[PDB]
Design a protein around this ligand. Structure first.
Ligand SMILES: [Mg+2]
Ligand SMILES: [Mg+2]
Ligand SMILES: [Mg+2]
Ligand SMILES: [Mg+2]
Ligand SMILES: [Mg+2]
Ligand SMILES: [Mg+2]
Ligand SMILES: [Mg+2]
Ligand SMILES: [Mg+2]
Ligand SMILES: [Mg+2]
Ligand SMILES: [Mg+2]
Ligand SMILES: [Zn+2]
Lengths: 45, 97, 136, 86, 96, 23, 107, 116, 122
RNA sequence: AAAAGUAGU
RNA sequence: AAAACUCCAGUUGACACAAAAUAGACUACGAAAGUGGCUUUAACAUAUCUGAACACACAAUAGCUAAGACCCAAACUGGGAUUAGAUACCCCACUAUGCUUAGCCCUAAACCUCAACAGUUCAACAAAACUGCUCGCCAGAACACUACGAGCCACAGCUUAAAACUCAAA
């Protein structure tokens, strides 16, 4: 199950071909790993 | 003659269980000027304050509502080989009857 | 109302002091030793306005290390800066010692209003190593 | 040195009440222990004598937090004589 | 016969206190979580008695706070003044 | 305790190093 | 000194990975692993060719093979790192821990 | 919270270097320590300043700032007054905490006994 | 194994910071690396005035290159990041999502130690 | 801050 | 207080082979010595136990030799107070040295003064008492961490280690 859940992720590995798009794809896009927590164990963004 | 182990099973102290924040009614059995001595049953007494709401309603025998926090009031300290009971209970008063 | 954390140089705020922002009110630098107190009053674009130390105002030995020796280092630290108009002061205090509060009483008894107080006491995160310890 | 300049160790004086704005500024350094740590780095405290000091500080903290448990556990039993005659 | 108490495995004990970050995952990029455990005046890490973390998760906080200072993700000498109104989970006395 | 069995052996070794220096 | 193009010990009983992508058989490979995963197949390569009861790893004859693999892990460590006196203990204790499991094998 | 003390002191069973090296045995005594106080305060320093701040400007003549130098006496009157009463209000009753001597008489009522 | 490349660049104008966002990735598959993903964390303000090769910086764009690579490629990338003129500080951390968590069941209240001293008269 | 000595059971 | 420093001090920038606040109220790792800035790589012997004054491997700080680095600290030394004197405490400056490389020297209150492995619940002080088994070591004090032999890259060294004379105690 690692391998069949690895096969579909190989389709999104950055190749030498499919490269110049996904330099521009995420330089347009964004991700933030930023979140706090409260005095209860509940995460607010 | 009823067996001890049976009458312990049918005994309202046993039926209560973990006594945290549990509604208990108790008799007052000694009044001092500010401090109320409520005998709810149990092993010990407990001491409360005389509130400013209905402060004359607390006489000897006045059935009073108690949250009954934690019949212990024992704690082991840093040198001790037993632990220091105070022979009290820290039950907090609520009301009357 | 009245948050304590200073209005950030991340814009923007709602506090003007004599019609000026936070970041252009002049800064006064108590450098407190254990036997001295030099005070320099600096523009927020870093121009010096007044200098009064503790040893400047008379004293020259271990009477420099007292509180009132820094209070007259602060009373003189206003009127040398009050030739330019320094009515609002940010305070940066560096180092411990006696004349830390007692010099900070000189700036206000010289009539300069203090809006902020900062302890830029230089603590290394284990940088150099200091002298060998006393044996008193 | 290379941070932003007036954020850290900054306390703002409310309407001219400097004598508390130095108290609360003393407190925040003293709760975090910078004032306790400034007055030790005046003289190089020997690496032997850190372990002799910071195992007096910890071991004083055990006893101190145990009295100020036991006192709080017995400050309820100081009201009056309930009996006074026997 | 049937009457005497049995030996069972101790009920009425609620399962043990899950700290604040019990199943979560600290990052070095997650500055707004990490900046919550440093002081808004000195930038110093609050201890286990303040933060109320278990000793496992307190050490992942400190191994990621000190990971993030040298990488240019969070500052050393203060809290991020942008990230100042987060839920104050660290219990501290000053100005009551 | 007493360091008196250390001080007696302390001085022996100081006298030995002062003797071995001199000659 | 195995080929770095091979698979790990753990990924041999997947019967589809001899026909996968070149990334996947490089992602599942000895070149993309922590170098202890060379040392996993060494105990498995050698437990074939030497003992008639492989995948055992609890006997007298099995324990010598695992140690004489990890002795070489220190010898190749100590090719570099000559002042690293921690592994020079581990080498020179594992030499002589083999020498008693060898002696316990003659007897 | 009281910090943990299982593996800390070097004992017979603990297979380890000690963490703590206490000189007195770590047993609560049935007596709390008395009250420390009153270092070299030396008040009315800052109001002596302005008083001596008239005096070098002027010839020395006192009624140039008569109004002010009574104020330097006024806190000096008050600083004498406060230290008189403060030494009594720590004796009639200190609220908040107890006194140690109204604490010691309670700690003997529940003495920490380590001798079984 | 699998690494994140916490990489801060210098604030340089999307035609000309995607120029150099390639040349890190080319220096991954020239060291044999298989680049998984790229992300942008944004062009935030630097936590302190980083001065690196050789001039002073206050703005900085934050990226992340998640990749696999062999053992030898990691100490050879930090060379390539060092002589770079357009990066600020790139440090190759292992991906924290290789190590799976322990089930932290919760804290337990530890007692005071017992039998710490003898039961002597004293 | 500065104090050194007091003959033998 | 002197002496020194005015080629000085205070801001604000540029700045490190030095040292690693808080976290550290944690109880971790390693045989010990030791080890708490960050990243990564390599990496933490042995499913019985014991086992070296008969070997192999290591061993804080100090110290040696060769070559660097040099912010700060600092034996030695110099200056200045102090004192009856002050070869010391206090002040200031500076060197060996601390650090890096490469080899030695092989010692500590190297002590948690409590050997390893397995197992149970009273001299006095201290850190409660005691079994089984093994190895090491001890048997009055001082002479003696000494003398002589021997070993050692050590040469004013280390390891091992007595006797005579004395005492009726230590
Ligand atoms: Mg002692
Ligand atoms: Mg053995
Ligand atoms: Mg050595
Ligand atoms: Mg030098
Ligand atoms: Mg120097
Ligand atoms: Mg170093
Ligand atoms: Mg030791
Ligand atoms: Mg010994
Ligand atoms: Mg042994
Ligand atoms: Mg030896
Ligand atoms: Zn937890």
């Amino acid at each position: 199950r690692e391998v069949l859940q690895l096969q579909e992720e190989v389709k999104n590995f950055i190749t030498r071909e499919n490269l110049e798009a996904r330099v521009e794809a995420a330089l347009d896009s964004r991700k933030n790993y930023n979140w706090a927590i409260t005095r209860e164990g509940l995460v607010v963004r | 003659v009823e067996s001890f182990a049976s009458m312990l099973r049918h005994s309202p102290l046993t039926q209560m269980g973990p006594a945290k924040d549990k509604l208990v009614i108790g008799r007052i059995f000694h009044i001092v000027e500010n401090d109320l001595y409520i005998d709810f049953g149990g092993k010990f007494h407990c001491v409360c304050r005389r509130p400013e709401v209905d402060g004359e309603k607390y006489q000897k025998g006045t059935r009073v509502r108690l949250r009954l926090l934690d019949l212990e009031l024992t704690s082991r300290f840093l040198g001790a080989t037993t632990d220091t009971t105070v022979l009290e209970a820290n039950a907090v008063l609520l009301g009357i009857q | 109302k009245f948050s304590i954390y200073p209005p950030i140089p991340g814009e923007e705020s709602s506090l003007r002091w004599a019609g000026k922002k936070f970041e252009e009110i002049p800064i006064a630098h108590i450098k407190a030793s254990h036997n001295n107190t030099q005070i320099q009053v600096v523009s927020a674009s870093n121009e010096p306005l007044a200098f009064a130390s503790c040893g400047t105002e008379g004293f020259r030995n271990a009477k420099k290390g007292t509180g009132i020796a820094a209070q007259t280092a602060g009373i003189a630290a206003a009127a040398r800066a009050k030739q330019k108009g320094v009515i609002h002061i940010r305070v940066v205090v560096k180092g411990l010692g006696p004349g830390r509060l007692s010099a900070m009483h000189g700036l206000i008894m010289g009539g300069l209003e203090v809006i902020s107080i900062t302890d830029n006491t230089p603590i290394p995160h284990n940088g150099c190593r200091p002298r060998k310890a006393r044996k008193l | 040195a290379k941070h932003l300049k007036f954020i850290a160790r900054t306390v703002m004086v409310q309407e001219g009440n400097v004598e508390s704005a130095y108290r609360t500024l003393n407190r925040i350094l003293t709760m975090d222990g910078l004032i306790e740590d400034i007055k030790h780095r005046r003289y190089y405290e020997k690496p032997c004598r850190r372990r002799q000091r910071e195992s007096y500080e910890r071991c004083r903290r055990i006893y101190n937090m145990e009295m100020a448990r036991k006192i709080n556990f017995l400050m309820r039993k100081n009201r009056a004589d309930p009996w006074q005659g026997c | 016969n049937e009457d005497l108490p049995i030996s069972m495995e101790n009920p009425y004990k609620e399962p043990l206190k899950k700290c604040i970050l019990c199943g979560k995952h600290v990052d070095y990029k997650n500055v707004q979580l990490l900046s919550q455990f440093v002081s808004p005046f000195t930038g110093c890490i609050y201890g286990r008695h303040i933060t109320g973390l278990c000793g496992k998760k307190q050490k992942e906080i400190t191994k990621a706070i000190k990971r993030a200072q040298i990488m240019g993700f969070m500052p050393v000498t203060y809290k991020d003044p942008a990230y100042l109104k987060d839920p104050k989970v660290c219990n501290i006395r000053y100005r009551e | 305790k007493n360091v008196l069995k250390i001080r007696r052996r302390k001085m022996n070794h100081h006298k030995y190093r002062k003797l071995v220096k001199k000659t | 000194d195995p080929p770095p193009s091979t698979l790990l010990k753990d990924y041999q009983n997947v019967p589809g990975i001899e026909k996968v992508d070149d990334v996947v058989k490089r992602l599942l490979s000895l070149e993309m692993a922590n170098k202890k995963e060379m040392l996993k197949i060494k105990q498995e390569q050698f437990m074939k060719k030497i003992v008639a009861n492989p995948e055992d790893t609890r006997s007298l004859e099995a324990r010598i093979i695992a140690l004489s693999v990890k002795i070489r892990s220190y010898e190749e460590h100590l090719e570099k790192h000559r002042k690293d006196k921690a592994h020079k203990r581990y080498l020179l204790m594992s030499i002589d821990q083999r020498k008693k499991m060898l002696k316990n094998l003659r007897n | 919270a009281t910090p943990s003390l299982r593996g800390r002191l070097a004992r017979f069973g603990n297979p380890r270097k000690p963490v703590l090296k206490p000189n007195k045995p770590l047993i609560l005594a049935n007596r709390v320590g008395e009250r420390r106080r009153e270092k070299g305060e030396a008040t009315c320093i800052t109001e002596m300043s302005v008083m001596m701040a008239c005096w070098k400007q002027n010839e020395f003549r006192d009624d140039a700032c008569r109004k002010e130098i009574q104020g330097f006496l006024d806190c000096a009157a008050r600083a004498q007054e406060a230290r008189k009463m403060r030494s009594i209000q720590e004796t009639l009753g200190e609220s908040g905490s107890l006194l140690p001597n109204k604490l010691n008489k309670l700690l003997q009522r529940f003495p920490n006994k380590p001798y079984l | 194994p699998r690494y994140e490349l916490a990489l801060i660049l210098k604030a340089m104008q999307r035609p000309e910071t995607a120029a150099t966002l390639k040349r890190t990735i080319e220096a991954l598959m020239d060291r044999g690396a298989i680049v998984r993903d790229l992300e942008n964390l944004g062009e935030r303000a630097l936590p302190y005035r980083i001065s690196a090769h050789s001039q002073q910086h206050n703005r900085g764009g934050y990226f992340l290159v998640d990749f696999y690579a062999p053992t030898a490629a990691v100490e050879s990338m930090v060379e390539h990041l060092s002589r770079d003129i357009d990066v600020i500080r790139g440090n190759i951390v292992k991906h924290p999502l290789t190590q799976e968590l322990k089930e932290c069941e919760g804290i337990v209240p530890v007692p005071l130690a017992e039998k710490l001293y003898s039961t002597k008269k004293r």
